Amino acid sequence: TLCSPTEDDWPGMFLLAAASFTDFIGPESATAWRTLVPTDGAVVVRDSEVVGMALYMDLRLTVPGEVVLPTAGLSFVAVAPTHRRRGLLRAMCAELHRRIADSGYPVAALHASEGGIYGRFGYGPATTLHELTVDRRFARFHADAPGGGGSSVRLVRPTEHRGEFEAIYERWRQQVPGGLLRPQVLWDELLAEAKAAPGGDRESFALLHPDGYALYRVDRTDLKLARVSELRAVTADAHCALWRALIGLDSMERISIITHPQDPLPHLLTDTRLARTTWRQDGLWLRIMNVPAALEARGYAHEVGEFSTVLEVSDGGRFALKIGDGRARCTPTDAAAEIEMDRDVLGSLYLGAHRASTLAAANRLRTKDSQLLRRLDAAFASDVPVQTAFEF
Amino acid sequence: TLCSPTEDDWPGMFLLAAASFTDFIGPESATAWRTLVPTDGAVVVRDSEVVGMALYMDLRLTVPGEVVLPTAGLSFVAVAPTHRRRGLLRAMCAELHRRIADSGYPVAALHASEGGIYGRFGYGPATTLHELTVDRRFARFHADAPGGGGSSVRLVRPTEHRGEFEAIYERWRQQVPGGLLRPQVLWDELLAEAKAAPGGDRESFALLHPDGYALYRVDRTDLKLARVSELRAVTADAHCALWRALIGLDSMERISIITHPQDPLPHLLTDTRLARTTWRQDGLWLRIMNVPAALEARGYAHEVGEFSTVLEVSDGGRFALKIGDGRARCTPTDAAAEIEMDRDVLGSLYLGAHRASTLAAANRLRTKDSQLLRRLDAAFASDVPVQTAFEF
Amino acid sequence: TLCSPTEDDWPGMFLLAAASFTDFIGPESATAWRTLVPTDGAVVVRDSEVVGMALYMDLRLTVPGEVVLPTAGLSFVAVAPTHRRRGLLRAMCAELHRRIADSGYPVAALHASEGGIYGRFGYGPATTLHELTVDRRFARFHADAPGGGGSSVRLVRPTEHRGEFEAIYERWRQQVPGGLLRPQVLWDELLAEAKAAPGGDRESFALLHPDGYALYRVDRTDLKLARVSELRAVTADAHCALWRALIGLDSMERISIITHPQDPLPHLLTDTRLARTTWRQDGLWLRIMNVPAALEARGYAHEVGEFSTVLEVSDGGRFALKIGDGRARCTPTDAAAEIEMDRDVLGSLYLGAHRASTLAAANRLRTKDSQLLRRLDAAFASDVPVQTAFEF
Amino acid sequence: TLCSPTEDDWPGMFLLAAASFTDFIGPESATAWRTLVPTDGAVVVRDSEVVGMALYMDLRLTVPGEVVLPTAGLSFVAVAPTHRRRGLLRAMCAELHRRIADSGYPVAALHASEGGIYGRFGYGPATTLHELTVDRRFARFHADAPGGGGSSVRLVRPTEHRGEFEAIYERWRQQVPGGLLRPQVLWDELLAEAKAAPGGDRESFALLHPDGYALYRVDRTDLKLARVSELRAVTADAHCALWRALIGLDSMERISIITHPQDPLPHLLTDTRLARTTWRQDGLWLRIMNVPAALEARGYAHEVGEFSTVLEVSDGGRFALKIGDGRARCTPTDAAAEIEMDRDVLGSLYLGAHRASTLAAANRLRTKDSQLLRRLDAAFASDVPVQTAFEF
Ligand SMILES: [Cl-]
Ligand SMILES: [Cl-]
Ligand SMILES: [Cl-]
Ligand SMILES: [Cl-]
């Protein structure tokens, strides 16, 4: 049977969690994340022990046009290894989606453990994780790079500058598509992870600028690699200044960061090739819950002239879509469809990370008009490049 | 001293080549590539032995709008290890650029051995190489993917279907920015490399469709890896059909290809994550020789409304640039600059591989108007994604 | 500005330390090492936070002839990654050298994080670290090797035999060039490191002989490798007996030790090749602060007949150097130089680790007389091979 | 039975060779090396097939004092895997040593396949192979390094400059202890190996100076490693000039060379640590056949004053040894021994690669007088550092 969990169910859920997630944050930390789950935000399957669970958290997601949407963040999704191929995932996703839609969320979001699961439930990959590794021994800043003229950056202990990190992040998340509000409990969690653990991670340090910060630590095993866990810069000056400081970590051979495809770091160096892409993966996945609410909520490129089309989402409705002056109107119609796509495809287009033209070339997006394709491409494009905030 | 080489100089140039290039194609093959070098296309430095050399080949490069430009392809550039830090590279590049400009080439192009060299001579990286590795054991085609309904693809010996490869490639290179005309000597060279070599590469096979081909071989050392040397598809149907056949290589674990960032392959699969980005690097580099000729020659996005600005290229002139109805007019002016950039930056923008906004964020492109930045971004964008033809 | 640190500065110095040194011993241990730093032995740069620091400790260094010199041991040298290329290192080294020279130290010493830094400040590499790895499964002792006839060696817990280790080390450090006095705080530190740490190093064991000891532990990750942290032997009998016991660690495949190039271990085995050199690096670096005081203080080889020359140290003075009966007299002169060298070169010659002839072949040491070169080589040679005591 | 081989035996010897030596040069090349084997220079054991073989070649070895000794070079030593532990090696070594001693050779020499075999037959390791790997991307020459002011070095094809290589090598081998005369057949062999082989080694190049040459090739598998097979420099200027050219191989990450422990290369660089010791091994092994002839033939250090002692070689005679003015007189005596050592130990001392003091510390060399030890150390030391010529 499928139920909202009682307080009695949570020890059983933590057991399933520990057995399902190698990166399980543990019961103390999980209890803190729990404060972000609304009443009726969780489902469990009992056989009595917990053999399936899924929940969503109340999130705030920034989309193009600096618009902030209420977002259901799916998380803590697990089926017991004893109960595979019994349709438990489908049943739990159907119930949560029912609750999320009824609660009035226009979008749901998740981070996927595997890439093959969530497409069939209407989730499309919406942000791209891009790992850059810099061999900092060869790194020289271009003549054009800002801040090559005191340093504005300070090396600090993260726990002593929480207020400054919170304020910089709050500015960042409001101006960048993919930005998430980071509540106080997640700041508590982040700064507890900044601590060195015996047999675990090394101490984290911060580089602090008025308009940016970098959190980094030396890798556990590779003592010549510094991993930047987080760099939030609100200005180009802040971004360059922080990278000048990171390239100044003279005891390291390599600096690595999980960033976005449009990170300007390579262009700050005389040799763009030194900032090597070592890893690429889907970041945030989006399911558009309400097509017209979602399409009307975001801003569109002003550079494209007013145009009208008919969009059909497979079992998601058909809409007269009019885009002009950076705004969309999206109304019901029975007029012939000019564009067809599955719900997951719309999620992938929504933050501007994937081009309509690319999805059309894979036949994930069907139209008979190449002009309409170019107009969609241009309109859905994001002025500010889409980034990934934090994993949940 | 710096001279055009005589026939007597070429053995000395082949020695320097063998000592400079681990992938040196050898004197027979080098003599065939020589047929693409015009009279006065080569310079040598003698100390008497050859201690420096550089040449350019007559190429035809496709740019956005399906426009074909005469292009000087720099190649075979080497300074003897005995004559480093003597300004030989600067002297040879200055002389060839003089000859290329005087001959009336609007653009020069090269493939860079290192990323830190050619920026200072006005070359910007203009295409992006993107290696995808597919674990084909898990690869399943999406319900939406074309051609899941006889097969239109044939497994053939490359040497027996030269005419068909030539015709498909000729269609491809004319419609794709980054496309190069492949002369008969380079078809001779390609199909000679398709042969198995004792102690060297394994036999190459071809997958042939009416509207595409793939050339592939099993890796020398990794016998569970097939490397696609070349996939040219003129239709989405051809692209999907060829990938269905490659995923059908049941004796392989992995298929790898050097492609472009907008390759739709990931979107053909139920799990987009199976097409892993394993390597990323600059491909073709461009030096704009004549700013107004180059800017007027290419097509621009129709989606952006007519706009005017003043572009200054650092020691490259200042121009009144008017872009409307997908065309540019670029005339001399002494009016105040609204946009400033080095010549290399313009090369990087020219085929639409890099966004003005990204280069602006690194301060490689200076303007005080963010609206102008969005308009440049939109205008210079390529409808057909930029690809890399063949290395030279 | 550049100041001696107050008690308030030390938390800021520990932050810079933690961020600069992956092997940072932590504030408790650093506070113990602090007891070896004299009043005015430390400098800091403030921007207010600590952005640069450097100090020296009062050490006692054994040089050829069993002569013990007061030595300034430079340590804890760091510039913040935010303040690179601002001349902070040069400023801090200039001030400490001023204080060290004025305090009457004839020599300064350090261990170098990188090999390219300290040459320009007059430091030359003076000892050579030589890692030997023995595949002990094949190791058989030569018929000639001592102690192949009860065992004189005991397997003990290090913490229970501190008095015996202290007494053996005190005998060792007084008879070996490179020997350092090990104060009580460093014995406290060493025997605390002998403990097993959860997620860290395994338990240390000791092999104890009347005239030697070995400290060893099994490697964290490679459980078939025993690492000898320290072997101090005052007699050849002790050295051989300890190696017989180490080769008796039948659960190990390999024994590794960081020793000196003249370690006789290879010659104790029937197969000298079993003691493989797996790593070689500069150990102790010396800056001669007072040329005449340093040259007069050490003993010279008795085998070379009395000779006189004129030595010029680049911006270090010119001296009439007379060496006879194992003693040097070194007096000011304006007579023509017969030998010229930078100060760093003299440091490299001083403990007999590097031959004048080898440095002459690199033109680091200039003379027009090859007989003088042979005489310098012979005179500066050390009867007892130079070893490295402990890192600081 | 044990016989000198007939012409009929050599096919059987080549079979045993092919099965015994993974680096077997093949019958053509082996037939060329054969020209260096004197009449009665070879023994075979037949069971009829060849189950054991050993031979010596007529060599000329340079020893300290630029003295050239006739030397029996043992080579091509093999016992069939079917005939191990049957005393065939002992029987063949006894017969060849009988023939070598009777023929009037003062010394025999070999390169050892394993380090544990040849000690018991009186061979001691006499030279040390020292592999240096330079990360040439970081390598900068010291201000003091010669030739930092045209280049005197030429990049050439080895086969076109045989005369120049022969003349430089002939100068080198006469002035360096360990030097071997390289006959014309071995020059034929060397320049045939300079060729690229299909599925094998890449093409060899030469760097040619009036007073030195380097032979190098790119590694088969590691295409960023250049291996210097041979560098012969007669002057410090030649040595530095050749290394400036090798560091100029800008397509390589690393240059490796098998050199000697006193190679001045590290001291030519601003960072001595960049020239990393990656491998160390015994090179040439010596068996002193006639103790008095060998000890009287070499020159001794002039810096040590005249001294007399009594040397006993274990089953090798007892001698009154008087060393003065760089010469030794070595006459029979029954006077009490002051120094005792096995024959192999004398071989190890003979070229100055190993110190008497080091061998004494392993009890391989016994005396009750530490003054005598220092005098032996000083006297047997080589002014010109011992190098290894070519493997045989
Ligand atoms: Cl991101
Ligand atoms: Cl491509
Ligand atoms: Cl040591
Ligand atoms: Cl050598």
Curated annotation (Swiss-Prot), chains A, B, C, D:
Q: Which GO terms describe its biological process?
A: aminoglycoside antibiotic catabolic process; biological process involved in interaction with host; effector-mediated defense to host-produced reactive oxygen species; response to antibiotic; symbiont-mediated perturbation of host inflammatory response; symbiont-mediated perturbation of host innate immune response; symbiont-mediated perturbation of host programmed cell death; symbiont-mediated suppression of host programmed cell death
- Please tell me whether the keyword Zinc-finger is annotated for this protein: no
PROSITE patterns according to UniProt: GNAT
Its EC number(s): 2.3.1.-
Where, by residue number, does acetyl-CoA bind?
V77, A78, V79, R85, R86, G87, L88, L89, R90, S113, E114
Q: What happens when the gene is disrupted?
A: No significant difference in terms of intracellular survival in U-397 macrophages and in an in vivo mouse aerosol model of infection. A strain lacking this gene induces more TNF-alpha but less IL-10 production in primary human monocytes than wild-type. Macrophages infected with a M.tuberculosis eis-deletion mutant display markedly increased accumulation of massive autophagic vacuoles and formation of autophagosomes in vitro and in vivo.
Q: Which GO terms describe its molecular function?
A: aminoglycoside N-acetyltransferase activity; identical protein binding; N-acetyltransferase activity; protein-lysine-acetyltransferase activity
Where does the UniProt annotation locate this protein?
A: Secreted; Host cytoplasmic vesicle, Host phagosome; Extracellular vesicle, Bacterial extracellular vesicle; Host extracellular space
User: What are the alphabetically sorted keywords of the record?
Assistant: Acyltransferase, Antibiotic resistance, Host cytoplasmic vesicle, Secreted, Transferase
Q: Enumerate the spans annotated as N-acetyltransferase domain.
A: 1-146
Q: Signal as a keyword?
A: no
User: For this UniProt entry, what's an example GO CC term?
Assistant: host cell cytoplasmic vesicle
Known activity regulation? Is potently inhibited by several small-molecules that share an isothiazole S,S-dioxide heterocyclic core. Some of these inhibitors, when used in combination with KAN against resistant M.tuberculosis, efficiently overcome Eis-mediated KAN resistance by restoring the antibacterial activity of KAN. Some of these compounds also inhibit in vitro acetylation of DNA-binding protein HupB.
**Outcome of mutating H111A, per the record?**
Decreases catalytic activity on AG substrates, leads to a change in the number of acetylated sites
Which family is this sequence assigned to? Belongs to the acetyltransferase Eis family.
Q: What else is known?
A: Increased expression of eis due to point mutations in the promoter region of eis is responsible for resistance to the second-line injectable drug kanamycin in a number of M.tuberculosis clinical isolates, through acetylation of its amino groups, which leads to inactivation of the drug.
Q: How does the annotation summarize its subunit structure?
A: Homohexamer; trimer of dimers.
Protein name, please? N-acetyltransferase Eis
From which source organism is this entry?
Mycobacterium tuberculosis (strain ATCC 25618 / H37Rv)
Q: What is the lineage of its organism?
A: Bacteria, Bacillati, Actinomycetota, Actinomycetes, Mycobacteriales
**Gene designation per UniProt:** eis
